[PDB]
Design an enzyme around this catalytic site. Structure first.
Site, mmCIF file in Angstrom:
data_model
loop_
_atom_site.group_PDB
_atom_site.id
_atom_site.type_symbol
_atom_site.label_atom_id
_atom_site.label_comp_id
_atom_site.label_asym_id
_atom_site.label_seq_id
_atom_site.Cartn_x
_atom_site.Cartn_y
_atom_site.Cartn_z
ATOM 1 N N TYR A 51 0.871 -1.170 0.000
ATOM 2 C CA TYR A 51 0.000 0.000 0.000
ATOM 3 C C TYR A 51 0.909 1.222 0.000
ATOM 4 O O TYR A 51 1.831 1.284 0.826
ATOM 5 C CB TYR A 51 -0.997 0.057 1.183
ATOM 6 C CG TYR A 51 -2.423 0.024 0.649
ATOM 7 C CD1 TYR A 51 -2.916 1.099 -0.080
ATOM 8 C CD2 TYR A 51 -3.256 -1.048 0.864
ATOM 9 C CE1 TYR A 51 -4.212 1.089 -0.593
ATOM 10 C CE2 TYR A 51 -4.545 -1.087 0.345
ATOM 11 C CZ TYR A 51 -5.009 -0.014 -0.388
ATOM 12 O OH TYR A 51 -6.279 -0.037 -0.904
ATOM 13 N N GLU A 53 -0.309 4.842 -0.782
ATOM 14 C CA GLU A 53 -1.026 6.097 -1.078
ATOM 15 C C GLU A 53 -0.081 7.265 -0.793
ATOM 16 O O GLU A 53 0.758 7.173 0.112
ATOM 17 C CB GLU A 53 -2.307 6.261 -0.287
ATOM 18 C CG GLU A 53 -3.314 5.172 -0.540
ATOM 19 C CD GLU A 53 -4.390 5.145 0.519
ATOM 20 O OE1 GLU A 53 -4.056 5.177 1.714
ATOM 21 O OE2 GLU A 53 -5.563 5.052 0.158
ATOM 22 N N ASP A 197 -4.183 14.728 -25.304
ATOM 23 C CA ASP A 197 -4.210 13.298 -24.956
ATOM 24 C C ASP A 197 -3.381 12.578 -26.016
ATOM 25 O O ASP A 197 -3.862 12.290 -27.123
ATOM 26 C CB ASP A 197 -5.629 12.795 -24.864
ATOM 27 C CG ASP A 197 -5.768 11.316 -24.598
ATOM 28 O OD1 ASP A 197 -4.749 10.605 -24.545
ATOM 29 O OD2 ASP A 197 -6.922 10.857 -24.441
ATOM 30 N N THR A 223 -1.644 6.940 -22.290
ATOM 31 C CA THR A 223 -1.637 5.572 -21.799
ATOM 32 C C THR A 223 -0.168 5.162 -21.919
ATOM 33 O O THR A 223 0.577 5.757 -22.716
ATOM 34 C CB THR A 223 -2.522 4.647 -22.628
ATOM 35 O OG1 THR A 223 -2.173 4.787 -24.007
ATOM 36 C CG2 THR A 223 -3.991 5.005 -22.409
ATOM 37 N N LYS A 226 0.274 1.815 -25.636
ATOM 38 C CA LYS A 226 0.111 1.825 -27.103
ATOM 39 C C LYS A 226 1.468 1.914 -27.776
ATOM 40 O O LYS A 226 2.292 0.986 -27.646
ATOM 41 C CB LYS A 226 -0.872 2.955 -27.472
ATOM 42 C CG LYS A 226 -2.279 2.702 -26.900
ATOM 43 C CD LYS A 226 -3.264 3.799 -27.314
ATOM 44 C CE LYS A 226 -4.638 3.636 -26.669
ATOM 45 N NZ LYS A 226 -4.564 3.673 -25.183
ATOM 46 N N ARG A 232 -0.129 -1.782 -19.260
ATOM 47 C CA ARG A 232 -1.403 -1.074 -19.373
ATOM 48 C C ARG A 232 -1.594 -0.112 -18.200
ATOM 49 O O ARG A 232 -1.642 -0.533 -17.045
ATOM 50 C CB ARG A 232 -2.497 -2.126 -19.462
ATOM 51 C CG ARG A 232 -3.889 -1.642 -19.805
ATOM 52 C CD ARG A 232 -4.768 -2.846 -20.196
ATOM 53 N NE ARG A 232 -4.255 -3.465 -21.424
ATOM 54 C CZ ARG A 232 -4.526 -3.012 -22.647
ATOM 55 N NH1 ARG A 232 -5.316 -1.962 -22.839
ATOM 56 N NH2 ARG A 232 -4.024 -3.598 -23.720
HETATM 57 C C1 LIG Z 1 -13.303 0.169 2.704
HETATM 58 C C2 LIG Z 1 -12.284 0.596 1.701
HETATM 59 N N1 LIG Z 1 -12.787 0.886 0.477
HETATM 60 C C3 LIG Z 1 -12.075 1.324 -0.627
HETATM 61 C C4 LIG Z 1 -10.677 1.472 -0.500
HETATM 62 C C5 LIG Z 1 -9.964 1.950 -1.717
HETATM 63 O O1 LIG Z 1 -9.217 1.002 -2.439
HETATM 64 P P1 LIG Z 1 -8.076 1.335 -3.460
HETATM 65 O O2 LIG Z 1 -7.722 0.080 -4.152
HETATM 66 O O3 LIG Z 1 -6.879 1.738 -2.504
HETATM 67 O O4 LIG Z 1 -8.595 2.473 -4.261
HETATM 68 C C6 LIG Z 1 -10.082 1.184 0.744
HETATM 69 C C7 LIG Z 1 -8.646 1.332 0.897
HETATM 70 N N2 LIG Z 1 -8.153 1.384 2.145
HETATM 71 C C8 LIG Z 1 -6.731 1.686 2.436
HETATM 72 C C9 LIG Z 1 -6.446 3.178 2.644
HETATM 73 O O5 LIG Z 1 -7.186 3.940 1.694
HETATM 74 C C10 LIG Z 1 -6.319 1.023 3.819
HETATM 75 O O6 LIG Z 1 -5.127 0.885 4.267
HETATM 76 O O7 LIG Z 1 -7.373 0.794 4.490
HETATM 77 C C11 LIG Z 1 -10.866 0.737 1.869
HETATM 78 O O8 LIG Z 1 -10.277 0.487 3.023
HETATM 79 C C1 LIG Z 2 -6.550 8.878 -27.014
HETATM 80 C C2 LIG Z 2 -6.992 7.813 -26.067
HETATM 81 N N1 LIG Z 2 -7.121 8.221 -24.783
HETATM 82 C C3 LIG Z 2 -7.533 7.452 -23.707
HETATM 83 C C4 LIG Z 2 -7.836 6.093 -23.940
HETATM 84 C C5 LIG Z 2 -8.279 5.316 -22.750
HETATM 85 O O1 LIG Z 2 -7.355 4.416 -22.189
HETATM 86 P P1 LIG Z 2 -7.716 3.220 -21.244
HETATM 87 O O2 LIG Z 2 -6.449 2.682 -20.709
HETATM 88 O O3 LIG Z 2 -8.323 2.164 -22.258
HETATM 89 O O4 LIG Z 2 -8.720 3.765 -20.295
HETATM 90 C C6 LIG Z 2 -7.722 5.596 -25.253
HETATM 91 C C7 LIG Z 2 -8.031 4.202 -25.515
HETATM 92 N N2 LIG Z 2 -8.243 3.838 -26.790
HETATM 93 C C8 LIG Z 2 -8.716 2.487 -27.174
HETATM 94 C C9 LIG Z 2 -10.241 2.367 -27.261
HETATM 95 O O5 LIG Z 2 -10.837 3.082 -26.182
HETATM 96 C C10 LIG Z 2 -8.222 2.147 -28.644
HETATM 97 O O6 LIG Z 2 -8.248 0.996 -29.205
HETATM 98 O O7 LIG Z 2 -7.943 3.234 -29.240
HETATM 99 C C11 LIG Z 2 -7.295 6.438 -26.344
HETATM 100 O O8 LIG Z 2 -7.208 5.941 -27.563
#
Ligand SMILES: Cc1ncc(COP(=O)(O)O)c(CN[C@@H](CO)C(=O)O)c1O
Ligand SMILES: Cc1ncc(COP(=O)(O)O)c(CN[C@@H](CO)C(=O)O)c1O
Lengths: 405, 405
Positions: A51, A53, A197, A223, A226, A232
């Site tokens: 973790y 953050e 973007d 991203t 690509k 990813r």
């Molecule tokens: C109950 C609860 N819900 C959501 C999240 C968020 O998850 P992410 O994958 O970190 O976005 C948490 C995360 N908890 C962390 C601190 O934010 C922890 O140490 O509890 C959570 O507890």
């Molecule tokens: C220009 C551009 N911007 C953002 C995203 C989104 O990325 P994610 O990691 O998929 O959330 C894309 C993604 N493009 C994909 C289809 O959505 C593709 O095949 O072009 C993008 O192109």
């Protein structure tokens, strides 16, 4: 793999099918690529257990000394690659990178100007079924009906009329160089921020084969998977003056704990992109795209904008009386993977379309060159001009297998 | 690792430091755990190369036949584990799982009732610097000042007064069982949806050691990486009637392409959780937490709520005249990782606090049992009662090393 085969035969069998599938097909989806073994090893590491953050040296949990080193390597290598003053390598995806910039400078309902989705714009650039379109008021600029090149006078007219708080430049399906200088000039005229973007062209930008948006845009999103050929995920680049706000937008703003193992893989991919051979690779991507474009024109196909300046091209299939959906389906039958894609001013809906989008980043990674591009074009010509001939399709399958081994 | 050491010595050295760090310390951060080698191998697979927007059998890209199998394995195993009618295994994190549910049933500015953040609620449950708090109007319910148990009359009074569209139950730092039946009864009284964020207790729920929220909540969110011991990411569970809307909220709503390699790892972790030994593991987590709680009370510590019904406990350090920040810092000096954490009605700010949060999921995964819990408590007593003695701290370091080998 050693432990997966024994713990989960079903998941392992499916992964192995996918691995073999990646080798056997000709992958032309413009947003795909093949990551290195080193990048995969970084994402298959024990860094998923941590973790973290917050940011390096400013975390909300102890014991982050070593994941801090990994995150800073990613940030510093990103900064060297793109010449940015600040980087945020925590975005979980391109969607989350875009979401955080929007969260940083926009209030609910603000007007945003982005590329028409049916002319090349992305879903996160205003689709009404995406958060961008639901949360904000998006207006769009288009490309010229004949050249298919962005109409900068249209960008300017829409900006002056709608007075957007933010202008978004870049796309998921635009085959020509984008003029970021003109975008910044229009943004300055109307007092708007400029967001670029660069997801699709990030690797090309890093290799100096596409103008860099960093010097012109307030915010640059991307991203890492690509043309940059990384794991990813997303990333945001920006000047030192918006650094604190962008970092706060990602956390505590829109995400929680970052994927430290994926950040390690981003660092690895950035290290690969800093090497001279990545620049040679990127040049071959663009060279191959040009060659492929020319070879397809030689088969009688019409290309949106008449060719390409980057890794991707769009075929307008109207002359062949085919929809993109039909072409995508028959190319799938022979082992060639493409996407249906609207073309500018498409008479068909986005679910049918009159085109196919093709990119060369993935086949270039696997070692394909100019002769392979000529053959790929020849195979697509054979298939699309003979959609009702099972003999032509079987011949295409044998020619695809000859290319993939 | 084979390719990473040679391609990127810097990233590899940092990962190796982190791996050794994970072995050498006593990890008591309540949200952490150690994933299996099979789970890591699934996330280090070639599935990162595949674009798969959409859902199994309803994708926007061809060639998803095998990643479809992986995603369905994850969904079906999740459904068997929690008895849910539908699962969405695409959320990139707990934050994105929560964000998608909010996006599904709330409009900008709607009122939401969640647990007071300083009594156990999470950042995504209304923090004013998080999207939850910025996008919506959050109101909070608290725990009793003496028992530290949720005051269900307070939940009901706040719901009737503020008329929330959604009520959120569950927490990041609540050591007792949550009564989801009462939460649903209050939600029904005021016509609100009920969302249960079970991130922390998901593994316990799967092993039948905590009441399951599935039958009571309209929506159940979770992370896959805490007590569930999976890869880092999120998941949403819900009844068949909200399935289409929840799926649309994730995509095209708030994300783009899913992390198919992480979904493969989710499937693997879900397969591990379906086995009998995971149920034995989970019981040991709770048994160890109780034992640890009792042993800390034996050292003279006061525990929020007087003990624990789950994997976590909170020490109220006021009796020792220590802040959580001080205790966290000195425990870090001896190799014990905890978090500072506000306690209910804390006189100190969330950056200083009067408590530390501790959980046993990670040390239980590494094989620690009741005797180890007694020693961990004895070490924490030695350190916190002798913060100015370097001899006591050096003794603690040697006792920590004896436990970790
Ligand atoms: C109950 C609860 N819900 C959501 C999240 C968020 O998850 P992410 O994958 O970190 O976005 C948490 C995360 N908890 C962390 C601190 O934010 C922890 O140490 O509890 C959570 O507890
Ligand atoms: C220009 C551009 N911007 C953002 C995203 C989104 O990325 P994610 O990691 O998929 O959330 C894309 C993604 N493009 C994909 C289809 O959505 C593709 O095949 O072009 C993008 O192109």
């Amino acid at each position: 793999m050693k432990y997966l085969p024994q713990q989960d035969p079903q998941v392992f069998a499916a992964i192995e099918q996918e691995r073999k599938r990646q080798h056997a097909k000709i992958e032309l989806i413009a947003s795909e690529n093949f990551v290195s073994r080193a990048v995969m090893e970084a994402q298959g590491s024990v860094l998923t257990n941590k973790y973290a953050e917050g940011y390096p040296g400013r975390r909300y949990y102890g014991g982050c000394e070593y994941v801090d080193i990994v995150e800073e390597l990613a940030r510093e290598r990103a900064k060297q690659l793109f010449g940015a003053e600040h980087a945020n390598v925590q975005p979980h995806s391109g969607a989350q990178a875009n979401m955080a910039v929007y969260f940083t400078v926009l209030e609910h309902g603000d007007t945003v100007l982005g590329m028409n989705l049916s002319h090349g714009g992305h879903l996160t650039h205003g689709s009404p079924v995406n958060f961008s379109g639901v949360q904000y008021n998006f207006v769009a600029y288009g490309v010229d009906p004949e050249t298919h090149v962005i109409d900068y006078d249209d960008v300017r007219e829409k900006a002056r009329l709608h007075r957007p708080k933010l202008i978004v430049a870049a796309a998921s399906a635009y085959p020509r160089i984008i003029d970021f200088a003109k975008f910044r000039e229009i943004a300055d005229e109307v007092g708007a921020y400029l967001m670029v973007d660069m997801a699709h062209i990030a690797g090309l930008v890093a290799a100096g084969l596409h103008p860099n948006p960093v010097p012109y845009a307030h915010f640059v999103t991307t991203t890492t998977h690509k043309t940059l050929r990384g794991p990813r995920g997303g990333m945001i680049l920006c000047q030192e003056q918006f650094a604190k706000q962008i970092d706060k937008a990602i956390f505590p703003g829109i995400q929680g704990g970052p994927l430290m193992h994926v950040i390690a893989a981003k660092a690895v991919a950035f290290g690969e992109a800093l090497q001279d051979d990545f620049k040679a690779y990127a040049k071959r991507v663009v060279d191959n795209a040009k060659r492929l474009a020319s070879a397809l024109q030689n088969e009688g196909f019409t290309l949106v904008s008449g060719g390409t300046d980057n890794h991707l091209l769009l075929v307008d299939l109207r002359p062949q009386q085919l929809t993109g959906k039909t072409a995508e389906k028959v190319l799938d039958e022979v082992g060639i993977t493409v996407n249906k894609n609207t073309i500018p001013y498409d008479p068909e809906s986005p679910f049918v379309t009159s085109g196919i989008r093709i990119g060369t980043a993935a086949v270039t990674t696997r070692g394909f060159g100019l002769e392979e591009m000529d053959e790929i074009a020849a195979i697509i010509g054979l298939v699309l001009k003979n959609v009702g001939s099972e003999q032509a399709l079987e011949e295409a399958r044998q020619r695809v297998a000859a290319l993939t081994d």
